[PDB]
Structure formats: structure tokens, C-alpha cells
Symmetry: D2
Amino acid sequence: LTFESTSRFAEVDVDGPLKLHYHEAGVGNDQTVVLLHGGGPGAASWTNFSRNIAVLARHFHVLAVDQPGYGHSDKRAEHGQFNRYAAMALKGLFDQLGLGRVPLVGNSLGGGTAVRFALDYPARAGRLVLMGPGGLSINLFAPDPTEGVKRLSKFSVAPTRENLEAFLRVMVYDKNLITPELVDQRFALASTPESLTATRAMGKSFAGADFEAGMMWREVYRLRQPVLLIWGREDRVNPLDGALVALKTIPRAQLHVFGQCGHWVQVEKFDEFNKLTIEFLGGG
Amino acid sequence: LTFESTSRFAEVDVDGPLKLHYHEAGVGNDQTVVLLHGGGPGAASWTNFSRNIAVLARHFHVLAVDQPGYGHSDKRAEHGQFNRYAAMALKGLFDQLGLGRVPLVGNSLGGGTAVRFALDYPARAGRLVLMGPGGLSINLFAPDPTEGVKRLSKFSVAPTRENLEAFLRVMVYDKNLITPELVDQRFALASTPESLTATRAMGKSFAGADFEAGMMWREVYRLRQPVLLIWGREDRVNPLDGALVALKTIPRAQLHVFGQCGHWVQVEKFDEFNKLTIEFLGGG
Amino acid sequence: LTFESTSRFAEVDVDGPLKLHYHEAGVGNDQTVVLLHGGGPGAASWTNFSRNIAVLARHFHVLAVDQPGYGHSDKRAEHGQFNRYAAMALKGLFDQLGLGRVPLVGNSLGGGTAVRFALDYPARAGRLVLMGPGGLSINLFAPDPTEGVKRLSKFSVAPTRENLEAFLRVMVYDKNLITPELVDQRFALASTPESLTATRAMGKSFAGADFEAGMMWREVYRLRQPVLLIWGREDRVNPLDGALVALKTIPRAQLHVFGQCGHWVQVEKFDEFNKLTIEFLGGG
Amino acid sequence: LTFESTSRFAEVDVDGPLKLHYHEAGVGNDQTVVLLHGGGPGAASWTNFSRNIAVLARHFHVLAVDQPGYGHSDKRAEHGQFNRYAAMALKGLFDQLGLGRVPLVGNSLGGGTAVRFALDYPARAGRLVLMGPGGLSINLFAPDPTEGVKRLSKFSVAPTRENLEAFLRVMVYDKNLITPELVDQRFALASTPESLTATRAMGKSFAGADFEAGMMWREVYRLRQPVLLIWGREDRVNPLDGALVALKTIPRAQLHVFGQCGHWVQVEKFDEFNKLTIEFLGGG
Ligand SMILES: [Cl-]
Ligand SMILES: [Cl-]
Ligand SMILES: [Cl-]
Ligand SMILES: [Cl-]
Ligand SMILES: [Cl-]
Ligand SMILES: [Cl-]
């Protein structure tokens, strides 16, 4: 399984043509699962879920979708509230590929997208697995912006190698996972002019007049499916106090917290994460 | 596997002879695991872990120990702080059976016993699985006593069938698990004169001058092993806000919360509980 | 100041004529404040604020309003979502009295009414003082219904003096505040056919298709005024964990918690409450 | 009242002579109160309480004490656990001044010192007012070290004006309180070799084998006096989640939280803090 072997494109309509890049594996497995990556600079499906796709494709038909503005999907200079824009793109892909009701796995930004999708198109979303998710998290104790959000803003204003490294260090509990190669690789993807365009256009959409659609902690009492929340105890981006409203209000919620784990659960606890996701989604 | 086929006795020394009753299954399985039951009236190993022993004995050598004052273990009229008394009895059994370092699974009262044991005899305790545990729980938001503790006290003062039923109803989210047969069975065991003696002697030991040994939320930063905390979201005895100090201070802690689940996790989520315990303790 | 000297009536139109009883005091004083009582069986303005009205009336022009269904206000058998119903009546009274923008003080149910008024008529509500308020509270840890709400429901089904005394005793930390005289007086008002009609109507009102109107924790991020939340640490009706979403999301929030205090802050900590309220609303 | 008019020295024995600087005001007033400042680089009594001393001195006999390592008190290179060291010095000063039982007001580090004094010399501490206190705080959700503590550590390693300004800016909600004059004054005191010697010594002092002395959240259940905890909702040094164990376990606790307020409550909310403190300590 490689970037190239799994790479797929689709054209969907969201206020005009929109190119979506995704990865496909485990074709023929009975159960399809959609993976939605996190929102850090230079993030994309393949790099986000590298320690996971190969393992999950043993059990599931995996579609790992680059959200609009990331990886090889379109990087428009302007859009509405990001999670609803991303959910509309996903609905386009579901319709194009003929998907019915499919479970979603969403990390950070992609967890917000998974939830907005499950709220707006309730019959198309199955079980959700959400890792340090945006949108449905509200940090009842942590002052906003958090250390993780501040370092992301600083990179967006001064997109240097040093500021990217400072951002990546507050993603993980074990700062040795932040290797020169990782930094070099992510900096290379994050600093292209169209990636910077996509990241700037992000800032105006969470901060713009469309903000209420982002406040999904207000709405998740409506989710009817089982939802597994997964958190790193040491998450410095979306800290653990953000899980509480969703745990309380989602009728069939579950929460799993890993000690000695930051925001990148799927990396730092990759094995325990894969096993929890496989069991929760029904073993395939 | 039956009560009778699995039933075992040992005599250990704790301020004189003490008869311990336990159940044994999965003999010859490489990995021994000790189960410690909850503290409700008429509680014991076999009835507490009926939906679990058979499944766990497929993977582990299971010892399910009736704690002093419960089931067929000795029911003394007097003892010190209960968890240290129970941990001393367990240390006696470990020494008698030749056990080295063994993982412990503890529900409620038995979770407090497992923790006191792991603190006082650190080289004899392996991984801990703690379900709505006493001792290391401190309800930061819930006023004490909780609804569950109050109904237990009321039964202790007026040990009637009606007061036992009211206690058992706040153990579970789905009140239909509280069948006439369950009530009849538990009432029969709970209302014997020596069981009432054991339950009264309990009240004077958590409330007596030995109370600090009970406050194990103060001490669990010392645990060096992986610890899996398991909670019912709707636990009305030891509610979910009691998990927070242990989750924060145990270095290798994990927490799993089940929505639509009360204090009896091992009953209401028996399947998910068995699977989590099997994976966490290493699959056997 | 007496019940009779302060008594006033007004008629307002809320899907038809609606009689409202209120108490007026400190007519000399420039700053008006509206007081909205808690919602237990037999509650009313004069008794709910008996330790507060005389002290506040030295500084403010006090309007203590019997909410629809309570005291000498009309007790219809049918109405929509209670807090919205009571807020519409209060708004009718504001228009009749020629009030513009006025601070509100609200205990429990009255706190819910105050918040619904401030959200629906934002230009008419000044500073809010809310004591153990319903509506904006969401108990992130406590299983619902709480011990307090269950006792209130038991009285609705079986309106006996014993069930009312049991409810009143979980209202307060110091159970000696629940004197035989208080129980006899509240029970005499609560047990009338008109009051019980009101009590049941209010119940039904909270679980319709307008349930969203009761979930005010979703909306208080829009409040622009200073808001003083006041809680008893030992509130067993609306416990302390219910304060967190409001404290986080109300921009100019403050929280005062009293140890050794239950749900009736204005009674149990009357002197500290009187002083917090006078200072917060500007000393008059 | 001036720095010079109020200035006083005393010598006490704490493993050898120890010079203590303090400010004395309101000598007429019957009720003594001891003020203990926060612990940032260059902090001292006069500047830390500059918005409070004159107001409190109208009601109380004020003793504002420069803790060892700060202001004009001795700055040894070596000492044990800081709060215990500072508490021993204060106790030496109580004995020299002939004080019995006196209320203490403590910000941050000074809050930690106040609590250690009240635990080690229980008959000598009256009512406690603690603002964003160290020592009794345990951040149940925030990963440690917090943003605030990390900025303080960065200054210890690289004591520049830029690193001090960055630290001071995470101390407060309203960043305009961090004026060029304030930064220049604090930095001039913090950068002296004596102060930096103190700053580093204090660091080392917290991670010895006497670390348990710093974990005061384990011990404050033993405090018998009223304790007013005061917090900024936006404290990024000792965040709000650090209040919970103390509020739960101190029998006569109260908590006041201020929205739009960081770690320097006595500065950012000086008027509300002055009034809370005067009323709590009995008006003098
Ligand atoms: Cl860092
Ligand atoms: Cl399902
Ligand atoms: Cl019940
Ligand atoms: Cl291990
Ligand atoms: Cl105002
Ligand atoms: Cl006192």
C-alpha cells in the first residue's frame, strides 16, 4: 500500500466544480469506513493516518478523504463555515460513489466535519469515532485560545520552519516524535502559496459571521448513533475538558482517555487506537 | 463452571485465623488474574462476576476472592480500615498460593481493596482494572453522601426487602435488570445475622479513626503500572466526577466511560467490559 | 413592610388575560430590580425572599413577582414551555409599568425565567443574579434526574406532607431550616387543587417539541450583561457541575460558590447573598 | 502611606539568621492581616498589592511580607521546599511580633505559603483568602506544565526583557496592564544576580524528595477555618480546574470566579477583590 497505489480523485459540486483527492484500500471488505484527517499546516489523509490505513484496510473498505484546502483536494481562497463546506463536499462524494450509511473516523478538524455531516445528513452517517475533535469540544476550564491554537495562529502569520516546529511539539506528549524529517516534510507541504491561501481562508471562516454552525457542542444531543470519543490526557490543542458536553449530551456516547498521549492519538497510541476503532465499528 | 465446581477455601493469618472463600477457573492458563467484587448487601464473587468469570477463564487463570465479611469468607464483628484489612487478607492468600506479581480487577469496594493492595505491596500488583472504584474516587461535584450511599445506609438501619430493592435500582441505568428473583436472592443472603454483623462493622471502619487509609485519591500518584478506570456515565453510587483525580495523577492511567450504564458496569456492559479487560491485561 | 402593604396585582395578556401578583417595596429608590422565586411546591415571592426583600428594599425599588402557577398569580391548567410562558407574562408587566432595562434576580425556576427573559427580550434585562438556576444549568457529571428532581416528581404523583418534607430536606444543607411550621405552611399552599393543577401543567410543559427553549446553556453565550451565578456547593437539585457551561460561555460571568449551602442560597446564606447582590447591582 | 514610611525589617532563625522585609500599615486597627505576594520574577509586597494595601489598611493592621528570595528579604542560594521555607520564616516573624491567630491573604506562590503555614502551624492561621494559589491547586484537566509555568521556566534559562514581558502577558487578561514601565521595573529587580540566584534555587526546591510538601491538595481537608478561594476564569498559570479539589475538601470553603480576569486577581479586579476580602475577614 502506497500514496500512489491508493490515490483516487472525484469531482463533486459545491458552488461549482470541486476536486476531492482520497485514498482507497481494503476494496471488497464488507464494511466501508471514511477517515477525515486533522487540520494542522501541511496535514493530509495519507500522512495523518499512515500508522492506521494499512491496519484498518485488513478489516474495512477505507476511504481517507483530503478535506477541501488540504493535500491534493481543491484549495479555494474563499468558503463558508469550514465544517459545513467540508460536509457538503463529503455528501457529494457519498452520492458519487453510491455510499448509503457509513461510519466516520475523524481527528481534530475532521472530527468537526464528521459531526456536521452526521447532523446535516443523519441517514448517511453510522457510528462515529472522534479523536480530540474540533466543533463538538468546548474547553470549559482551558482559556481560549489554547497553547496549540496560538502556535497555529503564529505559524499562519509568520509561516517559518521554527514556528511550524513549535506548533508540532504541542501536538504530542513525546516530543521525540517531532523529527527533523517530519518538520522538513510538513514545512515543504505547508509553505506552498496555495496551502498558505487555504490556511488563511480557514481563519476568516471560524472567525466570520458563520461561527454558530461551528458550535456543535450545542447540537450533538441530536446524534442517535453510538459515538466513541478518544482523547489524549495531555492534548494541548483541544484539551480533555472539551469532551464533557459531548459525553453528557450524546445518548450513546463512550469516552476513552489515554494517559501519556497528546492531540495525535492515532500516532502516539496507534496500536490501542486501531484496536478500539476496529472493535467499536464491529470488527468489520 | 458452577459455584460448587469453582469453590475453594484457604486459611490465612490477619490478627488470627481468617477463612477466605474464592472461585478458581481457567487453571493452566499462563496468566493469573484476581477479581475483587463490590460491597452491596449480599454481594459475593460468584454473583458479582457471573457474566464475566466464564469468559475471562477462556484467557486467564481467574481467582475471584470473597472479601472478608462477604459471601463465604469470615464475617468478623470488628476490623480496622476495611480496604487495608481486605488487602492484608489478599496478601495472605497470595503468599499461601505462591503468587508473584498478578493483575487485579476490582469493582467498587473491591477497586479500593485492589488499590490499597497495589500501594502497600507494590511488587505483588500488576495492571489494575477498576470499575466505579471506591477509595481512589473523590466526587468533586456530587454532594456526599450520594443517592447510592444513602440507600445503602437506609438498608443497614432498616434491612427490609423494600429498602434493598430501592438500593439495587440506583446500581443500574436499566431498572429492568432488578428482577423479583435478584431482589429475593440478594435479600436472602443480605439479611442473615452474620451478614448484617459484617455490614454494620463496615460502617464503623470508613467512619472511624482509620479513615485516612480510605482516601486513596491522595496516594495513587505512586502507582507505576498501567491502570484502566471504567465508569458508567449514570453511576449514582460513585459518580463520574470521582474519576478525575485518579485519571490526572496516575501516570499510566486510562479511562473508559460507557453511556447508558450505571454502577454495575460488569453487568450492564458485560460484553464490552469483558473485551476491554481481556485486551488491557494482554489477551492472556 | 408586610405581605399586605406590599401586595399588588396586574392583568396582562398571554394567550388571554393573566392575573399576576407581586410585592413592591422601596418606591423612593431610583434603581428597580425584579425578584423571581424558586419553583418548589407552594413557593411564592414573599416567603422565598423573606430574608432578602427588606434589606434589598433599602437600596432598590423591589418588584418580587409570583410566577404564573404560584402564590396569588393565575394557575392555568395549560401553557407552553414554562420559562417562556413566565417570561412573556413578566414582559407584559414591564410594558404595563413602563420599565425599560431592569436587573433581575432569580432563584432556581425563577433563574430559568430570568435567563429566558434576558434571551427573548435582550434590551429589557440588565445585570442578572442567578442562584442555583434552572435552564442554563446542564449537569455535566450528575445523572438526571437528580435526587432533588426525583423528590419533586414523587410529590407530584403522591402530594403528601411526608413527600413535601422529603423534597424540602434535599433543598438545604442545614436540615433544621425545614421546621414543622415551614412544612405546614408550604404544604397548605402546595396541596390546593389549583396549585397541584399548576404543578402538573409545569411538568408536562418541559418535555414537548419546544424542549429546546429549556436548553438555555446553548444560548447564554449571547448574553452581553454582567451575570453573577451563585451556587451552594451541596445543591442536590441543580448541582454545582451545572454551573460550568454558563461560567465558560457568558462573557461577563462571575461565580460565587458557598460551602455548607444547598439549593436555597438566599435563605441559607441570606446575609452573604444580600451583600453580593447589593454590590453587584451597583449599591443603589 | 509610602514604601519608605511602611518599610520594616526583622531577623529570624531559619537554619541560620534570615533578614525579612515587610510593610506595616493601619497600626491603629485591632485586626491584623498578613499579605503574601505572588512569585513571578521581580515580584515584591509593595508592588504586588499596590492597588490593595491603602484600602485594606483603612480596616486592618496590614503586614505585607516579602517572601524569602523576593524584594528586600534575604536571597539564599540553598533552601528546602519553598512554601515550607517561607512558612518557617513567617512563623519566626509571628513569634517575634507576638502574634497569635491571624488571617492570611495570599496570591499564587504566597497562596501556597499561606496554606503550608496554616497546615504546619494550624493554631496561628485564621481565615485564608487565596487568589490563584499554588500548592493546593491540582490542574485536573490542564496538562502540566501550563503555558504560564513554561514561560516562567523560559525566563529562568534565558533571563531577557523579552522573556519577562512574555511571562507577564500570560499573567493577565487585559494585556494593556503590562505597560513598558511595569516591564522595565520588574525586569530591573528580576535580573540582579541575587534575584536570579533566588529564582533558580526556588525551582530546584519543588522537585526534591520533599515534593509531598508541595502537594497541599492532599492535606487541605484538615483546614477548619473559612477559606475564600478567588480565581480568574482566564488564569493561564494556575487554571480554574486547579480550584476543584480544594473547593470540595475544605469544609468551610467559598469560591469566587471573575470572568475577564487572569492570574493577578488583586490587580485586574482590585476593587471587587478589596471588597470581598474586607467583608470575608469581618469588615475590621
Ligand atoms: Cl514546548
Ligand atoms: Cl449501530
Ligand atoms: Cl428510583
Ligand atoms: Cl505492564
Ligand atoms: Cl452593566
Ligand atoms: Cl472564623
